[PDB]
Amino acid sequence: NGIVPDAGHQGPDVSAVNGGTQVINIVTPNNEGISHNQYQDFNVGKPGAVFNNALEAGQSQLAGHLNANSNLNGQAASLILNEVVSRNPSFLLGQQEVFGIAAEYVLSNPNGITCDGCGFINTSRSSLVVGNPLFENGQLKGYSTLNNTNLLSLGKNGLNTTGLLDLIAPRIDSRGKITAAEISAFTGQNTFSQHFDILSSQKPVSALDSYFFGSMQSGRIRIINTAEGSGVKL
Amino acid sequence: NGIVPDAGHQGPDVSAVNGGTQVINIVTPNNEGISHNQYQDFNVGKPGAVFNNALEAGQSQLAGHLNANSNLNGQAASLILNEVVSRNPSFLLGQQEVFGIAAEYVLSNPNGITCDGCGFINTSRSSLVVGNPLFENGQLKGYSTLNNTNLLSLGKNGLNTTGLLDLIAPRIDSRGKITAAEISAFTGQNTFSQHFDILSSQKPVSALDSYFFGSMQSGRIRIINTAEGSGVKL
């Protein structure tokens, strides 16, 4: 069970099929179109994971035939927000597919995220956030890496997506090929809007250095480090 | 004589002082405020080079006391555009200072530019272009790296500036520390506006791969490679 949902009302139903592929019946989206899913554990292996964002049955890439997700009161999620609410870090070693209607994807884990040979299928935009989402009366107001020194690690087997990629963490250490339509990496201790505009920054007490090694296969790359005096090493 | 001006009407007066520091009395700016200077050779050594953009006499950092540049019909240049019009590549091994009124700086050399321990003083924005400026009736319309496969090389001793830095070339190979307020690197075979907006791109016949190694000390870095399928290696 790489993925273990929270017991509470934001915990989706998670099932394994076939050779270990996990299928997530995401929770009903709220009025902003956000399916906010909370997890005690979130990890993906080589068999991959499929988020059921379908209004009709059909064939997924990773898990074969799936029925519609009956939680979609007739409207699919615009954003699939996956939040780790425990102290467990996340390891992403396989593909994640949005089955059904293409959507935005976020994984937020303030304990750390490691992606080695991970990928995103049928997402317009995928964001890995070593930090927390911020809510105000059940509405998503943005994300925070404040008071956090943990790491987003990208391994030698890289990260692939046909959509937009955001990489948000106090520090990033990448050693593999990153393939995306566009890459945005934002480092340091920051608050962000819903759309990853930087709203405020802290200076870390000690250096938060990021490393990029390997290749970036994308027509547009932006790296913004707000940690006054810390490095971006290539 | 690292710097050798063109004989023609865009050739500035170039003189050496002291221990080899070269002083460039830039040509009268045109009505758009551009001092367009053409060179048979443009190279800077450890003693540095000073562009006289002063309306009053005073103390330069690199060359001691200088009088005003009498070519400044009472208005300093907004942009100091340095263009190599020969086949000679450029080597920048020391600091370049704008004496007097701060301005934008461009060096365009389609034969190649190598910067090892180079730097820019009193510039708001400095751009190194392995390409040509484009003019239409004596007005600057932008820059081109079309039909060019040459290299902008940045050596192990790096590049320092307190202003904005643009690095424009078919390919870039960097091995040192880049320190700038913001770094924009645009690679591939492109036409650009005056302000380095990309207007059109060619796919090179063979790969134009860029390499970044070493560190980038800047709060904002953007790398855009338009060479469909070529790499950015870090």
Residue A58 token pair:
């059909």
Q: Name B56's Cβ contacts closer than 8 Å, sequence gap at least 6.
A: B68, B100
Sign of the torsion formed by the C-alpha atoms of A139, A141, A145 and A147? negative
Strand B132-136: give its sheet, edge to edge: B132-136, B139-144, B189-192, B198-202
- What's the count of helices (H) and strands (E) in chain B, helices before strands? 0, 28
**3-class secondary-structure state, position A210:** strand
Name the amino acid, one letter, at A201: S
**3-class secondary-structure state, position A127:** strand
Please tell me the distance from the alpha carbon of residue A175 to that of residue A177, in angstroms, as a whole number.
7
**DSSP collapsed to 3 states, A55-87:** CCCEEECCCEEECCCCCCCCCCCCEEEEEECCC
Please tell me the distance from the alpha carbon of residue B103 to that of residue B124, in angstroms, as a whole number.
6
How many Å separate Cα A129 from the centre of its chain?
Answer: 6
Residue B156's CB is within 10 A of a number of other CB atoms, namely: 12
Reference B140, options B193, B102, B86; nearest CA is B193
A222: which chain B residues are within 8 Å (Cβ-Cβ)? 220-222
Give the chain A residue whose CA is nearest to the CA of B225. A219
Sign of the torsion formed by the C-alpha atoms of A135, A105, A21 and A23? positive
Residue B67's CB is within 10 A of a number of other CB atoms, namely: 11
Please tell me the distance from the alpha carbon of residue B163 to that of residue B125, in angstroms, as a whole number.
5
Cβ proximity of A143 and A192 under 8 Å: yes
Name the amino acid, one letter, at B224: I
Q: DSSP string spanning A214-225?
A: SEEE-S-EEEEE
Name the amino acid, one letter, at B207: A
Please tell me the distance from the alpha carbon of residue B93 to that of residue A152, in angstroms, as a whole number.
37
Facing A215 at nearest CB: one of B214, B226, B233: B233
Shortest distance between the Cα of A81 and any Cα of chain B, in A, equals 27
A215: which chain B residues are within 8 Å (Cβ-Cβ)? 231-234
Q: Is B18 on the interface with A (CB under 8 A)?
A: no
Residue B157 token pair:
């001793």
Work out the burial of residue A206: count CB atoms within 10 Å of its CB; fewer than 13 is exposed, 13-18 middle, 19 or more buried. exposed
Strand partners, A128: A107, A167
Reference B204, options B229, B186, B233; nearest CA is B229
Q: Is A175 on the interface with B (CB under 8 A)?
A: no
B171-174 and B210-212 strand pairing: parallel
DSSP state of A44: B
The structural domains of chain B, ordered by start, are: 1-234 (2.160.20.10)
Reference B165, options B175, B179, B151; nearest CA is B179
Please tell me the distance from the alpha carbon of residue B76 to that of residue B62, in angstroms, as a whole number.
19
Strand partners, B66: B58
Please tell me the distance from the alpha carbon of residue B141 to that of residue A19, in angstroms, as a whole number.
60
A74-90: burial string, b at 16+ Cβ within 10 Å, e else: eebbbbbbbbbbeebbb
Task: Assign residue A229 a region (left: φ > 0; alpha: ψ between -120 and 50; beta: otherwise).
Answer: left
DSSP state of B195: T
Please tell me the distance from the alpha carbon of residue A192 to that of residue A214, in angstroms, as a whole number.
27
Please tell me the distance from the alpha carbon of residue A158 to that of residue A119, in angstroms, as a whole number.
8
Residue B202 token pair:
């060619």
Cβ proximity of A92 and A115 under 8 Å: yes
Please tell me the distance from the alpha carbon of residue B220 to that of residue B164, in angstroms, as a whole number.
10
Reference B224, options A223, A163, A63, A64; nearest CA is A223
Cβ proximity of A14 and A24 under 8 Å: yes
Please tell me the distance from the alpha carbon of residue A170 to that of residue B63, in angstroms, as a whole number.
44
Residue A149 token pair:
């020194």
Contact state of B215 with A224 under an 8 Å Cβ cutoff: no
Shortest distance between the Cα of A212 and any Cα of chain B, in A, equals 6
Please tell me the distance from the alpha carbon of residue A79 to that of residue B105, in angstroms, as a whole number.
44
Cβ proximity of B171 and B212 under 8 Å: no
Helices (H), chain B: none
Half-sphere exposure of A130 (CA within 13 A, CB side): 28
Reference A190, options A203, A182, A200, A178; nearest CA is A200
A212: which chain B residues are within 8 Å (Cβ-Cβ)? 234
Shortest distance between the Cα of B126 and any Cα of chain A, in A, equals 19
Cβ proximity of B76 and B99 under 8 Å: no
Please tell me the distance from the alpha carbon of residue A137 to that of residue A61, in angstroms, as a whole number.
37
Please tell me the distance from the alpha carbon of residue A172 to that of residue A70, in angstroms, as a whole number.
38
Please tell me the distance from the alpha carbon of residue B24 to that of residue B4, in angstroms, as a whole number.
10
Cβ proximity of A123 and A117 under 8 Å: no
Please tell me the distance from the alpha carbon of residue B159 to that of residue B92, in angstroms, as a whole number.
10
Please tell me the distance from the alpha carbon of residue A119 to that of residue A162, in angstroms, as a whole number.
9
- What's the count of helices (H) and strands (E) in chain A, helices before strands? 0, 28
Strand partners, B92: B44, B115
B168-177: burial string, b at 16+ Cβ within 10 Å, e else: bbbbbbbbbb
Contact state of B215 with A234 under an 8 Å Cβ cutoff: yes
**DSSP collapsed to 3 states, B9-70:** CCCCEEEEECCCEEEEECCCCCCCCEEEEEEEECCECCCCEEEEECCCCEEECCCEEECCCC
B221-225 and A198-202 strand pairing: unpaired
Please tell me the distance from the alpha carbon of residue B88 to that of residue B154, in angstroms, as a whole number.
17
DSSP state of A131: S
Contact state of B219 with A226 under an 8 Å Cβ cutoff: yes
Q: Name A44's Cβ contacts closer than 8 Å, sequence gap at least 6.
A: A2, A3, A22, A91, A92, A93, A94, A95, A96, A118
Q: Is A135 on the interface with B (CB under 8 A)?
A: no
